[PDB]
């Protein structure tokens, strides 16, 4: 199973991103104290690349990406690491290794006293 390296980057405008994402209730997730939230994104029948964007309001949150092949095989696309996404919008992409499901990991586990608000968005190509 050859697996392409992901791309990751950031872009400066956080305020505009959040204002745009807030327009959809389901695109804003509350990650509780010590909670890990997993957003599952399936590979698309016509699809090659997946895109993700996310931001938090105040505090950093853990972010990583795993791929679930269709007990099951789990590959690490993006290691989970705390991100500055409260300061800037964090984005990234990956080429489809095969048929399966992407797990977007928002990891608050290290946070004892603080919930996090996660604004996020997902695209894909053809």
């Amino acid at each position: 199973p050859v697996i392409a390296a992901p791309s990751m980057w950031t872009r400066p405008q956080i305020k505009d991103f959040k204002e745009k994402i807030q327009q959809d209730a389901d695109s804003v997730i509350t990650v509780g104290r010590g909670e890990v939230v997993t957003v599952r994104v399936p590979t698309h029948e016509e699809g090659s690349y997946l895109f993700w964007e996310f931001a938090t309001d105040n505090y950093d949150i853990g972010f990583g990406v795993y791929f679930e092949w269709t007990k099951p095989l789990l590959d690490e696309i993006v290691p989970v690491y705390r991100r500055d996404c409260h300061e800037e919008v964090y984005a990234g992409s990956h080429q489809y290794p095969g048929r399966g499901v992407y797990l977007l990991k928002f990891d608050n586990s290290y946070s004892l006293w603080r919930s996090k608000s996660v604004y996020y968005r997902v695209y894909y190509t053809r």
Binding site: E35, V37, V39, R40, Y49, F51, Y120, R121, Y123
Partner: protein, 43 residues
């Protein structure tokens, strides 16, 4: 346009404007958040 190129282009210069442009042209397609299964776990 190849997906490789859509990707490398967006990465190179990324903005809401470019997203919308790509979306309008069908190059990228937004995955509705209501279709996405969300899990929660406490460590």
């Amino acid at each position: 346009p190849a997906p490789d190129a859509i990707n490398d282009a967006l990465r190179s210069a990324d903005s809401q404007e470019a997203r919308d442009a790509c979306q309008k042209k069908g190059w990228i397609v937004i995955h509705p958040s209501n279709e996405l299964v969300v899990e929660k776990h406490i460590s």
